[PDB]
């Protein structure tokens, strides 16, 4: 009532007079819904600094973990996850003064390094509650900096950002794959002017000469060369799809990706393209050079037979290499869903089918003389289809691939479904009227299909039982097929360009980044260290005077203000 | 000029990729000439325009597969035509329509 | 440090006391990266009018050309091209008062008509640094 309940001091007096104050002051709730919550949580949540002081002065536990079903992340059946701790609670409700009191007080101090059941520290929690809304970001970033500086000053040896949860992530890594721009960019671009805790910055100013300031960012965690679960791999593979295109635009990530593209990305991608086209030319030559007369295996005695065998074995080697490199990639990465198939997930399917078809065709080639010839044709068709994969290297060609994929998937099946609905309806309409076969359905479907294209012959009007009705039905057929063609046209002309044209550049950016990272992960560990972006700058003396020696990355700017 | 240069060669490259793939697929299946590539190329090209005759279905070694492949040829060529339409018809008018006046101004000045 | 270093007048006094102040006050850098730069360039770039005054009053050359690889246009492997001259330097870093002092001073006046190695005068330089940004 009005911020003051007069019964608290007398209740505390009764608590110590009865001799069992300790069991009373911190009594956890027993229900599964609010399990573990203590009076300290209520005092902090109600925003009563003097009440939390008076409650902790008598021995309130400042480490009690509120782990009920209500205090769970929204994705796990709950309404508020604040880090499962009184200090994390005061931190996640924008209460700097209560946090200052909790961290330093004469009675009992709650250290910032304690982890909850999930392993989340205070900073993991402060990331978890962060939104991309600005009114959230102002206090999330500010108080993240406050807590980090306080933990540094109190404990100089440890780094609060360096403690991981049960998932192995760190606050920056956790913000990377949850999609929290406001704190992600603030963590990357932070710099500490105070010399006392300047060592925990991630953007240093190297040198300046007039209007040329060359500040250099720290990528100790962004680019680990496959050693410490780099933030970039998390951000490109496991991050939130809807916000990934914006996370990949932060200041030291776009330039880092461009650097990795120019350093080893362009040459490796292009030699891969050339090798793929050469292998496919060899595959086509082997397909054509195969003699159609004779039951395999063929006697390899002529030199022409030797080159045929060489082409066959190189095709099988390419197929097995494709299988090996596709199964591993699917094994390493999560199975995608909607809005991520058009990025990269689609091509693992197609190359998988290509390898499977080639291998099964080799199996039939072992025994079946007539059988194996069926899916060499499908193999070449599907492979020359997949040749469209490598257009992602060039932006102009990469966007057009997105055009083709989206047109083939989003609207093609919709139009095909409605079109087939009209086919079945009108075929059942026409054929049931005729007076006599089961096979007549097959002929009529192709006849109408040719009529839509214009190569259909109307000589069947004579055999119609009712000539008048079929003329009208065919006119409606033509008109409505034209109407559906116009519908597909109109969707593709307005609604596609409204959304897809803008989204195409964003999808190409993600495709380019994921191909860069795949090319990197192809290399062995020692080779990746050789192509490590950035310098080995020494930033300053540590707390013991030792140099930092952190692999930073410099980008220089021109500022006239 | 922009239609002839920027997108025409892109369409020609993709369409050439498709023709070489499907021609190598179809012709390698036939059971017997080197010159058969030229006849097949023009016949499929007419089929895309609509003046192609489908009388070779009898001579196919596997009749079933070639019907499916021809259907795919037609469908994806239609998809490519739709894609070129959509690209030049949203994205080009987004850029070129504004750029056309600016380029004409430079042409006029340089001719003066 | 905080805009003032106390060792400068002492070093200058040592410079005349050893008898070779002229070689000291304007000593060009020898590396290809910063070739030609003198203490006057540093004084002007750091935006110390008092230091540039006390440095030129003792006999600093106001026409020394900083032509190292760092002081080259961005297109030819460099980060800052300011006209290769102390006056062009004070002009290209928005220092009107230092330019006013450099043009008119009792000791040694730098005329606006002098050209650098490229031939660029002060105005060519002021064009070279200009961007289309309003600031
Ligand atoms: C000719 C030859 C032997 O060099 C070759 C090798 N691989 C393929 N592809 C490419 C691909 C396509 C689907 C995405 C994959 C899985 C991503 N991905 C996973 N690891 C990578 C390493 C480098 C690159 C690049 N550039 C992409 C990578 C790769 O599936 C295949 O079969 C085609 N030809």
Residue numbers in the entry:
A (entry chain D): 203 to 638, 662 to 786
B (entry chain C): 607 to 638, 662 to 741
C (entry chain C): 203 to 337
Q: Could you give the paper's own sentences about this structure?
A:
Transient Receptor Potential Cation Channel Subfamily V Member 4 (TRPV4) is a ubiquitously expressed, nonselective, Ca2+‐permeable cation channel that belongs to the TRP family. TRPV4 is widely expressed across different tissues, such as the skin, vascular tissue, nervous system, lungs, kidneys, and bones, and contributes to diverse functions. This polymodal protein can be activated not only by environmental stimuli, including temperature, hypoosmotic conditions, and mechanical stress, but also by endogenous agonists such as anandamide and arachidonic acid. Dysfunction of the TRPV4 channel is implicated in various diseases, including skeletal dysplasias; neuromuscular disorders, such as Charcot‐Marie‐Tooth disease; cardiovascular diseases like hypertension; and respiratory disorders, including pulmonary edema, osteoarthritis, and renal disorders.
As an analog of compound A1, compound GSK279 exhibited a similar binding pattern within the pocket, with stabilization facilitated by aromatic residues, including F524, Y553, Y591, F592, and I744, and the polar residues of N474, T527, and D743. Indeed, superpositions of the hTRPV4GSK279 and hTRPV4A1 with the reported closed TRPV3 structure showed that the three antagonist‐bound hTRPV4 structures are in closed states.
